[PDB]
Ligand binder design. Sequence first.
Ligand SMILES: [Cl-]
Ligand SMILES: [Cl-]
Ligand SMILES: [Mg+2]
Ligand SMILES: [Mg+2]
Ligand SMILES: [Mg+2]
Ligand SMILES: [Mg+2]
Ligand SMILES: [Mg+2]
Ligand SMILES: [Mg+2]
Ligand SMILES: [Mg+2]
Ligand SMILES: [Mg+2]
Ligand code: NA
Ligand code: NA
Ligand code: NA
Ligand code: NA
Ligand code: NA
Ligand code: NA
Lengths: 154, 186, 140, 95, 156
Amino acid sequence: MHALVQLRGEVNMHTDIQDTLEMLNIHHVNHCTLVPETDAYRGMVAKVNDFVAFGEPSQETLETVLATRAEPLEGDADVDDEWVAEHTDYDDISGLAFALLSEETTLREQGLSPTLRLHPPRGGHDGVKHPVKEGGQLGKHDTEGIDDLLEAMR
Amino acid sequence: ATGPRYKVPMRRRREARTDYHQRLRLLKSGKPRLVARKSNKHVRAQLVTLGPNGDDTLASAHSSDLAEYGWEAPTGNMPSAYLTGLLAGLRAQEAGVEEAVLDIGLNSPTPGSKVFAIQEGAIDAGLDIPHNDDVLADWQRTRGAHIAEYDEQLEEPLYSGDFDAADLPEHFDELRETLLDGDIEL
Amino acid sequence: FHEMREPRIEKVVVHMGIGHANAEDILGEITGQMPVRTKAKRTVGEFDIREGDPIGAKVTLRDEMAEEFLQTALPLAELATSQFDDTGNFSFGLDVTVNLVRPGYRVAKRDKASRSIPTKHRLNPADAVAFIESTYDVEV
Amino acid sequence: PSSNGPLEGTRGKLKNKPRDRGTSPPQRAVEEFDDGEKVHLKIDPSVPNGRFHPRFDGQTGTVEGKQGDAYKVDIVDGGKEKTIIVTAAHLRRQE
Amino acid sequence: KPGAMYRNSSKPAYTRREYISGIPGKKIAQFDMGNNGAGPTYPAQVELVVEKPVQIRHNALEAARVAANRYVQNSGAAANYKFRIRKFPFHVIRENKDGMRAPFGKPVGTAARVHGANHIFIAWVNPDPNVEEAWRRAKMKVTPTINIDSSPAGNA
RNA sequence: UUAGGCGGCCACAGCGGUGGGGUUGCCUCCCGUACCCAUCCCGAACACGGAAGAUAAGCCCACCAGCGUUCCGGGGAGUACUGGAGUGCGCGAGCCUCUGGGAAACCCGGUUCGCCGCCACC
RNA sequence: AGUGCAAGAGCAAAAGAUAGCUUGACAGUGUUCUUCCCAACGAGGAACGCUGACGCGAAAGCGUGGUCUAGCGAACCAAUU
RNA sequence: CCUGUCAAACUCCAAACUUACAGACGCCGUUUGACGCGGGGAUUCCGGUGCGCGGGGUA
Ligand SMILES: [Cl-]
Ligand SMILES: [Cl-]
Ligand SMILES: [Mg+2]
Ligand SMILES: [Mg+2]
Ligand SMILES: [Mg+2]
Ligand SMILES: [Mg+2]
Ligand SMILES: [Mg+2]
Ligand SMILES: [Mg+2]
Ligand SMILES: [Mg+2]
Ligand SMILES: [Mg+2]
Ligand code: NA
Ligand code: NA
Ligand code: NA
Ligand code: NA
Ligand code: NA
Ligand code: NA
């Protein structure tokens, strides 16, 4: 399972690429979604490769971001351990996190918005004109790499 | 053979066995084919249908297994062909086959030929087949009369030992008569 | 093995390549059976522009009709060698050609499952000279 | 295009590779299809008759009855519904 | 006319003589120079390598070749060496010589298309590289910057 | 399939070559023209009638790779080309990096001298 | 090679050649595609049927002119069936 | 036999890629009625630029 964050805007981006992000529930910059590692999903992320940051996050990081930026399908309600326990199959954020990571369920299945609306990266990211292997922030990241980004956008 | 661009004919065209232009036309009817084939000594008749991996023969008769019913004469003649046709035709009927189109392969549509005798036989067996009566022999020749008379110009038996000296178109009737009722494999 | 490997005469073609006939008559008597017209192909200067057009006749003789003919034709010829086919044929003379081959030739002349005669089973110039020379005359 | 006939720009699609040259096998010209079956359309360079407009080469339609020995195949050109009269010699069962 | 007009390979390949008439003859005199009777049985083999894809008019080929071979006469008219220009001017070139109306040009010449890194010239010499000099003069009359490369020759 | 008939795929099956096989299931060559039929001339062919002979053709069986073809390993080659991205480089032509694909020639070594279906048959 | 004529395509027991026979280059009426990709638009064209009458063939079958894509023309008026 | 080169109107080969249909996932629709059908009203038929691919042209 990979974490998807749009880092580049819609202006001037191919339409077929924009619709792809939209099918992955991201409609704004800094919006994140969690995607299972399947053939179907893999092709989609490859197509979006140049306007996004993605990678497999650590259990911890996912928990921090889930707690901090997860939302119900509808409403303000904070998604904390109690919420998770009183609304999902799991007993706490950690349990949900693990299930997501092991691709056993999805944010929607558990009554949560498929989108984690992140905050801009505190300290700024590495740039949206170059990929990771060049010092930029676009493309596939290290688990440590994704974690840094996700945590700076916590 | 000569290179990458060289065109090699379909196998059965190489073997000079199948006329594909005639085959297509034959298959147009959507009906089973009455395959009439000859050999120096025998005459074969098959009712073939189309299949996913090749033709399917649903019924057949060979001039050899004619003796199996009382044939004691040569098997490469007119009376032989007719009977083989009738025999295959009967087996055809038993198999639930009601109609067919005559496929004479690479043979020639010569009037009174053996392939047409085969066709006559199959039709009398009950098989409905597109035909033309005045392209068939005049019964007597089918019976084998032309050969009996030929032996009349004897001086030396037309048949080396075989059966009879003056031959028998009567043996023909006895057999046809036989095939038209009961008996095994029919 | 032999008997089915030994040569034999298959047709002798006597033809008079005239250029426009009355010649048939002699061909009929020299051979014994009707002659056949010889149409020509292509338009050419020898005032022979007509495509379909009688310009000679030929006669293909087989069996006895061929022997009974060669039993007078050969004697009227001397030549041999070099003037022989690579397939064991030879033409001399009014032309008189002799096509020679062995027993299983029908295999390449019939309609069903026809086939081209293997090089080995073909008749060589030499194996030809022998057969004929061994029939009322001499080679070279 | 410098002209607008049906065969304009069909040099490739209506030409056989040198080895597929020559009369095609009759088996596929007699194939029978049922209404509802999905068939791929592809003109066979060697078969003159039963063809359809070259623009439809590559389409995959639905057999929906027949006319004479030819079949009536329904396709969708862009957004438009069309019916194509075509013989078995130029059709293939999908899958 | 300047090479500026034809040195680039931005146009389609235009070489089909069955649809193009009035093509000027080539000015290139020979392609095999020196001892063409002998085969490359020499110790040293130097090559003139083009470093950029370009079009070289038959004009430049001839002047480049002449300037090189005419100089290789530091070895003599019947000297022991063989010189080869491996390219031929296949590309037909036009000129629109009315303004931009019906501008398809008329044939005015021919040029050879050389891709960066190909060798246009190859000389065969015994340890006597006067050829290295014949080429300093040759890449002097062709558009691109060039690399003088030696292959069989560890006799440095 | 101790040899047959109708085929499907239509060169992996072609081209060329070697060896083996028949008182019979057989196929052939073969023998022969009163008939049905036949040659713009010839029972050559086509058609019909038939077994004295033969396994030499064909055919069937076993096999050979020199040519052609099919597929595969290794090399060429992750090269050539290319869908997506870049305030990367270059006077420019053009190039480079990241991401997703990815060849052709040719060389060397294997494969391939058909596979499969229905029917008939010591 | 040939197949009337551009170019490209198709074709070998043929779509080519030869021979013989024949007039389907037929009347009537349609389905569909094309003309006009997608996407409306006439004449024209083609493909594929049917009804009727025929030709040839043992027969399956072929023949809705020429192997395929050019060779075409509204209303008003006249002549004609 | 050896040796030197090419093709918009060449091809023994042959991509990336575009494309018909189907299934799967995604997204979407069934009170926000999608897909589609029928009807009313238009405006519009001088376009331009960047990038990729081009054809013409010294540009
Ligand atoms: Cl037969
Ligand atoms: Cl159509
Ligand atoms: Mg909300
Ligand atoms: Mg700050
Ligand atoms: Mg920055
Ligand atoms: Mg043998
Ligand atoms: Mg036609
Ligand atoms: Mg007027
Ligand atoms: Mg009038
Ligand atoms: Mg395209
Ligand atoms: Na074909
Ligand atoms: Na002017
Ligand atoms: Na220079
Ligand atoms: Na005549
Ligand atoms: Na044999
Ligand atoms: Na119309």
